[PDB]
Amino acid sequence: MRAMERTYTLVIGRPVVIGEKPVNIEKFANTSKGDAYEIKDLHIEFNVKKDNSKEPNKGYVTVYNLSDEVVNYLSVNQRESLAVMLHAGYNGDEKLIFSGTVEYVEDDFPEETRTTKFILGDGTLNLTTATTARSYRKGTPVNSVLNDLIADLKLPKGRVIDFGNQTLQTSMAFTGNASQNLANLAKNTGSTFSVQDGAVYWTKEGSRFNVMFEISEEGGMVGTPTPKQPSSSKKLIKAHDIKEDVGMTVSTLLNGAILPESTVYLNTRYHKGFYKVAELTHRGGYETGDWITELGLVETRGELI
Amino acid sequence: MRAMERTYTLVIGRPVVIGEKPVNIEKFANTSKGDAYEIKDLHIEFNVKKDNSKEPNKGYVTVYNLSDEVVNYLSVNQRESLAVMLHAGYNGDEKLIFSGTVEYVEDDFPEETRTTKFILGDGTLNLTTATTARSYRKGTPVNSVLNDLIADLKLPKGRVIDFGNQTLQTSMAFTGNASQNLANLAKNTGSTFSVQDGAVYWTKEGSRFNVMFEISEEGGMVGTPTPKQPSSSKKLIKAHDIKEDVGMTVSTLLNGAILPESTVYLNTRYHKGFYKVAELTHRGGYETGDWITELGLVETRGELI
Amino acid sequence: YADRYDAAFGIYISRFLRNNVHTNIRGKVVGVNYSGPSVDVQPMAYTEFPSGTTDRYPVI
């Protein structure tokens, strides 16, 4: 008989180079020598937050007592963006939990124990340097503008909801970073745009997608759900009506197969119903600490897209 | 036989008044009575950070159980900028470690012990109020523009590297604070501008000045050097190339005879070579605490100016 | 959405420009002075927020 013990894996690959086609962090895993630097049995502490907004998802990691060779490989490439993947689970499988580029790295080795630090960004390089220069005339179909701008961003299309037969009412011009322009089109058309684990997600506010996840005491829930406001401020109201404005909170054992834009079903004894996801935070302490995930849910009032 | 014990001195002088010539904090030390208020044998905690950037270097100080007369002298002059100097060393000498103006001061005396607080700025008054209004035509030598703007700033010239026979390509106009205009000229010409302990330093990025300091176990080093990135973010690269982009970290016993723009030689058993300095932080606890200095080094790839 | 530290500054800057930083605008003349030529301008543009509130430029 065994116990139920945690497991994880961390991989470091070649520098990421942006080209003239969508970037996939998967293909950069292999190093010039072939197999990548894998780190399994070392105490690790990490925190990974995810959201549906302009900003990329960022995660922090700490590793104790790394071998000198690995640290040397990171002393080099300090000018470059190494690709990194993280996996976690329970002794039988490990689900992808983050993938991005090493934004920052530093080492402090006071006496007894060295402590390496990381800051990782989910597509930070693309979202902050992809320039654009486009224009359109009166009568252009809005569905064409959306596709044109996304292709400029150079990322795979996770999911998109086209506008239909919508047409521009006035001439438009777009410059600067493509991400910023798209985030502005979100406000005026009730659409949510956010990149996550390399995938572009374009959806409509208020509406939601089946029960892709069910939460219950069998599903490793942790404590009862509690109602928490989804924003730190309140807006004036007429009392688009379809927009968000309500939510709840839940916690569960670590499970990387969840994304901010997904949908979940809450099977508890007090609260029951369907909710959207709005925010994720993954925490982990291998030898000591939690191994759980926190979800911020938001009520929905739109059509079932 | 003795031990190796710490010593320090703190001096407070007359209010600083800016005039029509370079400001020297040295000449304001003497008070109307003559000798200044010197504080030697009182527990003191201080933190002084220094850098090479637009912002002035600021340091914090705390003193316990001050006499009522001294506190009274600071209750007055609360509208004025008193000059302050700080010294530290080891029982045989004390090196100047900071000099500036008292930006802030507050007193809290709950029951047993009063605790005075200070915030000091290195040339804050000059850098934030020196206005300018200048213009030049096509063909003007850039070396003339630089000297004209610095004289406006009203500070002694610590060190400057002239541009040679460079000439303006387009007409230029400068207004507002002189410091801001100079900091903009830095970006477009690969030069570093930063005031420190009253001295103006204008140098060129990438290049460095002899071994003015050597670090080794004999030189009171504290722990091994570790590689730390010199910035909290990574820039996109073509992979001016001469710019910085790499660095290291070291710690040493308190030594005020060091400046951000200097050069140091690192004689350790793993790392060996020459580095620039980029950042300093001086910490101190007289009765209890550290008495060390931390240096952030940056690799160089330019000519040996 | 509103969790990141940068989004807060983004919204704060966006709102700050709304009440200041006026540069150019179209308008229509409503009052004309022929001695020392000057004109009174009524800006035409406006916006309506989702909260049923409107922003009108005053006569200049």
Binding site: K58, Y104 | K235, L236 | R4, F9
Partner: peptide
């Protein structure tokens, strides 16, 4: 013990600086 607290405050300041300054060609 203030040593422990200063470290956490420093790390939070570092995270905020990273959030403000990231990516970009300049």
């Amino acid at each position: 013990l203030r040593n422990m607290v200063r470290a956490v405050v420093d790390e939070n300041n570092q995270f905020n600086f990273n959030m403000l300054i990231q990516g970009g060609p300049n």
